[PDB]
Design a protein around this ligand. Structure first.
Ligand code: HEM
Ligand SMILES: [Mg+2]
Length: 391
């Protein structure tokens, strides 16, 4: 018997209360069975890093189902190394800067332009969502007239990865996947005679450089599923961090090149990634508790961020902290391959929003709530981001 607690149902109006709560609980026990999640959880940063380091004992087997079967994150050993090299090549710094100029800036400009005559915004709906809706179709040569349809298809895929059990929902994921696959096949087949300038174009060419033909559609769908919702929760909590710290927002105006390190601090102070899951391949012990072969284990990617031994005054948002060793993108073998795109999109989007709305600030009349199921999503974050845009 693990000790048992219910820490993930915690809600609050204070964005830092949950990380405080987890770090307090971790002082009491690192490993505990969370009755709200239904699984054992590892809290302490050192235990989480240790689990992530030992991929042979703690695998990604639980992910290897439905539309995720055989995908990058499910892979270990040599299989992962080979496929990971392909992904790394299509998200390298040259590619990131290329798509900064060709795709993300134009999209960010359009998104921000829409707000220009308005007095208020709810920046989750009006920015955090809008960014990846525009960026994903543009990156992958998907038609503008299908953006809503494809949003619904992707949300259905994502639902199926969250509800691996339910065979109707999985079945709906599977169908949505096949419609996306058909659009993306059609686009990928055109690349042979008419190579494009899109990212889906660089992928089709990288598949050949590694001698694969691994489907182009496959790579693209992995990137879509890994970015489409994550991006919105990262943007959402960046905006929270900025709008909640008018002293910091003042410093950023004075010195715009501080934005990247401000982003790094937003990801420590208010990470959107609550946790990830591992499969215990052979009995092991972590923080003194025994974990039977076959256990499904949840790793907190937040508690480390609030451990005062690692980050002093962790409750305080400091844009000069320059923190490292955050867990928001994971650690080890499966460390997020998309992190360069996420960082860039956050920087580009937010810089454009800030420069366009000198008066941008929190709206004092609405009290967002923070939870680990905001609007049902698998994230940590606010239910809305009410802002004032004028004077
Ligand atoms: C915006 C914020 C993002 C966050 C917070 C996030 C977080 C994560 C985390 C925690 C993992 C590790 C999963 C595990 O170890 O179980 C991961 C892996 C991954 N992420 Fe992200 N990510 C984000 C953006 C993206 C983007 C933009 C892409 C695609 C462009 C993407 C694609 C992936 C892929 C493919 C993997 C698997 C990597 C591997 O197994 O080698 N992510 N991400
Ligand atoms: Mg790091």
């Amino acid at each position: 018997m693990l000790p048992r607690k219910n820490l993930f149902s915690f809600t609050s109006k204070d964005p830092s209360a949950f990380g405080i709560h987890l770090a307090a609980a971790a002082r009491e026990h690192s490993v505990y069975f969370d009755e709200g999640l239904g699984v054992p959880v590892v809290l302490r940063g050192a235990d989480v890093v240790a689990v992530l380091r030992d991929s042979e004992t703690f695998s990604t087997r639980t992910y290897d189902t439905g539309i995720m079967k055989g995908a990058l994150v499910t892979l270990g050993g040599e299989a992962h190394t080979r496929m990971r090299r392909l992904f790394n090549a299509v998200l390298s710094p040259r590619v990131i800067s290329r798509y900064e100029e060709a795709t993300v800036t134009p999209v960010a400009r359009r998104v921000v332009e829409r707000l220009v005559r308005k007095e208020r915004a709810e920046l989750f709906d009006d920015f955090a969502i809008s960014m990846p809706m525009g960026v994903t179709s543009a990156l992958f040569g998907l038609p503008e007239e299908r953006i809503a349809e494809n949003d619904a298809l992707i949300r259905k895929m994502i639902r199926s990865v969250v509800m691996p059990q339910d065979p109707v929902v999985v079945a709906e994921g599977r169908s949505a996947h096949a419609a996306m696959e058909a659009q993306l096949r059609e686009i990928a087949e055109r690349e042979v005679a008419h190579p494009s300038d899109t990212l889906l174009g660089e992928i089709a060419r990288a598949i050949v450089a590694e001698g694969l033909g691994e489907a182009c559609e496959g790579v693209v769908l992995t990137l879509i599923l890994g970015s489409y919702e994550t991006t919105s929760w990262m943007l959402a909590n960046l905006l929270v961090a900025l709008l909640a710290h008018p002293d910091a927002m003042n410093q950023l105006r004075q010195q715009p090149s501080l934005l990247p390190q401000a982003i790094e601090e937003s990801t420590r102070w208010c990470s959107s990634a609550a946790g990830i899951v591992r499969f215990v391949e052979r009995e092991a012990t972590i923080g003194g508790e025994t974990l039977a072969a076959g256990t499904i284990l949840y790793l907190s990617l937040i508690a480390r961020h609030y451990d005062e031994e690692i980050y002093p005054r962790p409750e305080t948002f400091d844009i000069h902290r320059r923190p490292v060793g955050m867990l928001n993108f994971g650690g080890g073998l499966h460390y997020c391959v998309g992190a360069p795109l996420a960082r860039m999109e956050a920087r580009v989007g937010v810089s454009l929003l800030l420069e366009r709305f000198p008066a941008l600030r929190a709206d004092p009349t609405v009290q967002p709530t923070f939870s680990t199921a905001p609007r049902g999503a698998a994230a940590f974050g606010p239910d809305q981001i009410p802002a004032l845009l004028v004077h």
